[PDB]
Design goal:
part of a larger assembly, 6 chains, A alpha/beta (430), C alpha/beta (427), E mainly alpha (46), A: 430 residues, alpha/beta, six-stranded parallel sheet, four-stranded mixed sheet, 12 strands, 16% strand, E: 46 residues, mainly alpha, elongated, binds phosphomethylphosphonic acid guanylate ester, binds guanosine-5'-triphosphate, binds magnesium ion, cell cycle, microtubule, nucleation, spindle, Tubulin alpha chain
Chain lengths: 430, 430, 427, 427, 46, 46
Amino acid sequence: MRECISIHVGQAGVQIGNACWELYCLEHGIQPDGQMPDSFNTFFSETGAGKHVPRAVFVDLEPTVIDEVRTGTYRQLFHPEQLITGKEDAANNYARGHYTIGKEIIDLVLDRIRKLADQCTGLQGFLVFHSFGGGTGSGFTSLLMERLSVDYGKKSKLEFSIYPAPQVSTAVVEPYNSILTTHTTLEHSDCAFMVDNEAIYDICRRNLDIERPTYTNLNRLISQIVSSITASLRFDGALNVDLTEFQTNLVPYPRIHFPLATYAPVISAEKAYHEQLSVAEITNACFEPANQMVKCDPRHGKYMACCLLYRGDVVPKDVNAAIATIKTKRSIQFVDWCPTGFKVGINYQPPTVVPGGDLAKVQRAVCMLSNTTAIAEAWARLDHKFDLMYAKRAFVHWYVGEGMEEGEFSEAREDMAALEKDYEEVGVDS
Amino acid sequence: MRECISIHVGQAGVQIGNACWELYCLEHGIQPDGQMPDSFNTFFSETGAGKHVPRAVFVDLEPTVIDEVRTGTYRQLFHPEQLITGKEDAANNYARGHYTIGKEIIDLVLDRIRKLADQCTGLQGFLVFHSFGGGTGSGFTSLLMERLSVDYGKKSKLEFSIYPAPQVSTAVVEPYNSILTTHTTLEHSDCAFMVDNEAIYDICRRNLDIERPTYTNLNRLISQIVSSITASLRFDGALNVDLTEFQTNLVPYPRIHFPLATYAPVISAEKAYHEQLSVAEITNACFEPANQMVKCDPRHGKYMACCLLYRGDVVPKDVNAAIATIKTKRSIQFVDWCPTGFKVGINYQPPTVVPGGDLAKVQRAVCMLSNTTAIAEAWARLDHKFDLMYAKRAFVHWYVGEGMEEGEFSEAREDMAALEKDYEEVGVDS
Amino acid sequence: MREIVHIQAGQCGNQIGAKFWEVISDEHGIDPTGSYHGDSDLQLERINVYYNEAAGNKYVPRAILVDLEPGTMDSVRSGPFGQIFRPDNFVFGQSGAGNNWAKGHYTEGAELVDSVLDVVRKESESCDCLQGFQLTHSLGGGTGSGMGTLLISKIREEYPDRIMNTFSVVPSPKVSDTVVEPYNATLSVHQLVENTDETYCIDNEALYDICFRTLKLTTPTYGDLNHLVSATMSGVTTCLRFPGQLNADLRKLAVNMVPFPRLHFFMPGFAPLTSRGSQQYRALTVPELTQQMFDAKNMMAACDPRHGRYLTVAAVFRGRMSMKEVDEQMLNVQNKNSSYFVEWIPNNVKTAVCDIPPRGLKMSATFIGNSTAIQELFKRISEQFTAMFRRKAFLHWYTGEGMDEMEFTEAESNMNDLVSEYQQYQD
Amino acid sequence: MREIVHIQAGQCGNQIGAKFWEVISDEHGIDPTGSYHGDSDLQLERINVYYNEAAGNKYVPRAILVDLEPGTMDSVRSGPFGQIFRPDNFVFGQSGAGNNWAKGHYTEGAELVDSVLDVVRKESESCDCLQGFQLTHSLGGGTGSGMGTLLISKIREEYPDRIMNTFSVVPSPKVSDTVVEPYNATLSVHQLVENTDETYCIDNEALYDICFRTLKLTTPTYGDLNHLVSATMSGVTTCLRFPGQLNADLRKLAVNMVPFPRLHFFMPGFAPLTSRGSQQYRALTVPELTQQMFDAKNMMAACDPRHGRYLTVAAVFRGRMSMKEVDEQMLNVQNKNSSYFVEWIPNNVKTAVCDIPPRGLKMSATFIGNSTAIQELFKRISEQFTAMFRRKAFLHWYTGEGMDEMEFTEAESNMNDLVSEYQQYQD
Amino acid sequence: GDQRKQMLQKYKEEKQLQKLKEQREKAKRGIFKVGRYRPDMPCFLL
Amino acid sequence: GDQRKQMLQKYKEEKQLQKLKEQREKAKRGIFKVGRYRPDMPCFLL
Ligand SMILES: Nc1nc2c(ncn2[C@@H]2O[C@H](COP(=O)(O)CP(=O)(O)OP(=O)(O)O)[C@@H](O)[C@H]2O)c(=O)[nH]1
Ligand SMILES: Nc1nc2c(ncn2[C@@H]2O[C@H](COP(=O)(O)CP(=O)(O)OP(=O)(O)O)[C@@H](O)[C@H]2O)c(=O)[nH]1
Ligand SMILES: Nc1nc2c(ncn2[C@@H]2O[C@H](COP(=O)(O)OP(=O)(O)OP(=O)(O)O)[C@@H](O)[C@H]2O)c(=O)[nH]1
Ligand SMILES: Nc1nc2c(ncn2[C@@H]2O[C@H](COP(=O)(O)OP(=O)(O)OP(=O)(O)O)[C@@H](O)[C@H]2O)c(=O)[nH]1
Ligand SMILES: [Mg+2]
Ligand SMILES: [Mg+2]
Ligand SMILES: [Mg+2]
Ligand SMILES: [Mg+2]
């Protein structure tokens, strides 16, 4: 039971999914060919005799990142109907991902999702992976969200997204895609996690002292986050957390479902020896402003509810001690209407280390998912960039040329404005 | 006992019969020369010492396919006077196969069938294989139907036919032959099955991932269907479905006897490893419009009776579970006057795999024969083609030139119109 | 000597009878060859009630094997304990009914039924004093329903003062594997109402429910379902076959369970039924046997006894145990559940107790209940029949063999009348 | 004979009950396989109060294990003594409430509560003289709190004259586990006020504090906390299970500790509790047991008894003991602390003496105290709820399954009424 | 605040009414139960 | 609807008449049939 289906959309989603499934195969002992020489039933379906297939679907309108999987070392893990390719890439266009190209490939992926969810008996939700700025990862992700909402309904919809960085982004039309996809994210998603590329970059530069990190480290860190999310469900612990439990304890209002996932401890091999890593200090490091994996300032916001997902040799003793010490600190301050704002989960399974990775093995690991008002200012600057581009009507003709109007841009902008007002009015004292 | 005679007429009939007899020789262990290096009595009659002769007759007005059989691998299987051969083909002309060329060979096929039928003591029925488009497979098959009806009478007649597609069609004068042969099939056949080449190509190209399928793959699929139908006669299982039982359970009204065949699983060797092939998923796949053996949408119609033929490692438990799940789905419509609409047969013999075939070895197999109203629209488009060609009287002179009146075309048109009216009447609720 | 002649019709009846003869020969210690190899003399004391003395200390069942397909005869013969049967008793046709009540009752049952009457005659005068017959069949098909029903009519014409038990498997709305179940079920019920003394409405879906939830059986095949039916219809006649502190033959249960002639459709049951895991966590006492018996979930009918009133119930107990406990338990069931029992029949329960239990269990029980819940098991069949009959669906077949729509109308009328009678006596 | 039905709800309730069955099978000499291996006949003289006789001299607990996810059932079964439980008593769903009182009380818990009621009906009818039920659950969760509260409501509807016991762990501000603790705590305390006969206010903070300073245990996991709660439960029930020089079952404690029907929230305590280092430096006598049980440190609630007035106090002693010694100790406690005991009740301390001490201890006692100090335990929950309720925080979840804010409002009205009652009887 | 407490009393009354209605509906036909005997006390001369 | 039930009664009557005629025809000569003796009961002074 307790199944959860992973959906990977776009290049970012597909690569993060490749890292995630590498990590899961290492976790459960599955070789890349799909063999085991129980608890793996969460993500892997047992077929026939000793053959495990992951409960995943990989979709991209271009076939390069999927043909890498079809010819890579994990080519025998999936079967071809879990790896769906289009003809023309969305080409960083929300319009192409949502209306023109997304329409002839949505039916097949929804059929695959239906066939996958029929096999599961205890489906807990969906883990959807995408990027805001990507045309596929915005448009087709939004289309798949609305189809899943009208199809499955009450099933939990958890998604991970790569929120564009304040200074760094590889696309010129990035804010358009971000606003366009978030206008439907606000209602078709139950809990959306954002991970910023600049934050992973400088976390790798400082904590892991990697001078030249690529997207491989990005996806490995994101895979560690998702593994810590699902560890309370793929193993056993003194304190278990389920996905619906996670939503209930983390989402205070229907429109406030955008928590910040931070992970600790991230250290190289050489710095692990000199540190006697206790639960208290990694818990403190989770609240440290430079360890947040979104480039924002928690000091300038208020924490609303944070979920603490411990794994390894962790006991409730020092967890409670660390939480009390965090409470006694005035730099980290919570909202007045949430006297208890800590959701706690302890798992006995330690985080596995993938060969070739830069993360050193640790007895204890923490993945705090804090819902805070400090993320409003990131969307504030995103709105500023959107307004700067939209005043001159730049790049709008590209979206209009294939079935979109200015009205959708205006309504998405005012929807984000209402969201900003919502964070402002929930962060205020009573 | 429980013998059934297979009659193959025309090129399509002869080639499908070649596939069928290759499959049956593989099923019972009969070597191509007719030797065993019981349960074969349904189709093979043991002659002399260790020699098995198929209970089949191969008739074609053209010699080419029959002499291809006479010099092929299975030349020793059939004795020559079963393989009946004319001089000139019907040449895609119903009149040639019915009145001029078919009348000089009809006595020989009838007395060969007589010599083949009095030999067996428990003759169950006739399995006539033909095609609607061809001149022989229409005219001569019709003539043989009247002769069998006036001679054998109450004995069952299961007829396999190839139906022209909306697009895939290799004969210009095809609709004329199709209408003319159905005008007699309506009353001289007990349960005429329906197969469309375009749908079989579509199934092969999506499921069996064959880019370039030929007629041999098509006949392999059709032969698998026929073997699944006759497995109850040829083997033993939890539930046994006879031919008369089949007709009683599938045909609600005397003129509505045109069920849609389908098969599941139809997958390649590389596909079967990853997929978990349970009873529920193949049962769902039989109702998938993508897997229909005829190009028509079951959604636009409503089911009237289904004959689930299970073979392999199948238990009645999950068969009942799958049928209940099918009942719960709102997309699969059933008529109100059929509260129970699933005739179920479970057999122990798994489907044998032809060496060199495209199908994969599977533990379970289903051949679902559904008497649906979706075939009315395929008949309607065939009727539109027929009367489009008839308004200009094109190709009519060819039929009139060799003993056929103008009135028979109009009377066959009226008969098909009455058939459509009957389907519409039985579709409406009460 | 209180003799029972067993008849099997159809594949379902033949397989259930094969398992019945399996369990009976196990109880009386008859080996596969057909010779006695038991240890207790009580096995041989009443061996005649189901068997015939052959030459050389060999016992042959008093069973008649009827079908229209030779395949089931071959399958029964090739199975275990299949060799004990007399080859003469195998009466089989060659065509098969094909789920046609009309065929098996009028067309090809007409010439096959004479041989069956000849064989059942020879068996009837081969015995000292018979009390009746035991037919096993199913209602969904045509051979079972039609053949066994015509056979029942002929037997009751020839033997009208003898009992007639029909352990007839009835169709179910969930487990429906033939399309013409309503027609055959209604036509067969039309004459089961008037031509038999006790009918045990076995259904497949309740057997599947027992195997799923009670037995915790992962993959129940037909072997387990037939095992359940065989155990129950062996416990019905254990009083005939074995000594007991309170005896009850078939006629006595017929008297105590049939207040009015048309209400003889009983909902059977068995106890104890445990999974392998819960075998050692369960005490084996009379109160828990009673608990399992009167559980509406343990029934082998598509009926909820909570939806109606019990007219009469029968508890044919088995094993060494006390009459005080058994009878106080039956009394207690009647007292605290007076709403679920009919009020104009005090002491709704009849109790029988036997000394020799089924093999492997130190005590056991067979539940038989004449409840008004059977009305809705017949209503579902009646409404499916009515849906299939307004549109004349599938009727060209049945009309093809001389049957007319008037017989369908009278069968529907008779079933509706029986449902009305059960509703009337439910109040 | 005065038997008790034990029920576990949620993960915390299941684990605490599992440790309780561990310690009580150790006390009664039952091995993990369920076969008696004790030495004294007193271990079987009253074995029926908790264990049901199974065939084969095997004992099964009268326990029903309830949760909304199968993980806790699998963890309980796979652990030690997990094989002793009856498999059908494992009533589990497939989703889990997800820290939602609504999902545990109305939507998905209420779907599963019917099976739990059926199993507890089996357990209550199988036994001769039932006296009451025990339920172990949390208050900050959705499964435990909400679903066990629904279960208590159903049981009281069905068994209004049987006592109700509930060992409830309540949230505390220090060890705050979830974010929706106050909602579930208030909604559960609401119906525990009128449905439970007596409730024990346990919390994880006081148990951790015990393990730190009294036990000197460096890294106490949840097993130690469950062991403390299990020891308290066993000490409460020992008068039923074992003899003594002055017996007091749960009804005696209820009538001597509940002066008014809404004041039945107790602070449990156990003596002696020692570190391994300090075991040999302490005399083992009644005065030091009495000083330990009355210490504000030994309480199992976040409640300082010095801040309130003891209404009634129960001290269930276990061991070979003088009665003069215990009685003089109670006089010294009630006289040196005349300002800490309520003044309109003379004899605030009840005494019960059992002659069978726990395993490994020659003398032990259990402290139960009905005090006005529960008022601040309720007030912290109430003020946390209020802080979360002006701003309408997390109410969209609970409103999603079909409640309204008026239900919450009447819940805090009830809790504030209870707080005012405790305050006004404190004076 | 008086309106709020009046609405609270009305809500409590409605809940009590529907609970009593459900109890009345349930009490018409008790559920099927089965247990041990509970024999009646013997009568003595007095 | 009364016509249908009258026709049903007529059909039942015709079927009963045919069945009675068949029974009368059969009863004229019973089938050849053989069993055991079934000895007569002894008579006693009374
Ligand atoms: N409980 C059981 N039901 C069975 C068994 N075999 C068949 N059946 C049920 O019997 C029903 C159909 O009746 P049969 O298979 O006996 C058909 P019959 O041979 O009587 O007539 P035809 O085969 O149509 O001539 C259908 O519901 C089957 O599920 C069995 O072993 N056990
Ligand atoms: N004293 C103990 N406290 C426990 C134990 N397990 C959990 N808890 C505490 O109880 C609280 C968690 O409540 P539960 O896990 O019982 C929640 P439940 O399973 O009933 O609801 P869902 O998790 O929403 O299904 C939290 O304060 C935990 O620290 C245990 O074994 N002992
Ligand atoms: N963290 C992380 N981000 C990635 C990775 N690959 C791509 N991205 C992000 O994805 C954004 C662009 O979207 P893509 O995923 O590359 O493309 P797409 O989703 O297929 O949409 P199209 O641009 O229309 O093809 C970039 O701004 C990157 O920040 C990756 O491996 N790791
Ligand atoms: N599926 C399938 N269809 C075939 C095959 N061979 C022929 N056909 C169909 O047969 C139709 C034409 O009839 P034929 O069988 O070729 O010719 P015929 O039946 O011998 O009649 P004549 O043309 O007069 O000789 C075509 O439309 C084909 O679709 C085959 O091997 N497989
Ligand atoms: Mg891309
Ligand atoms: Mg040709
Ligand atoms: Mg049959
Ligand atoms: Mg839980």
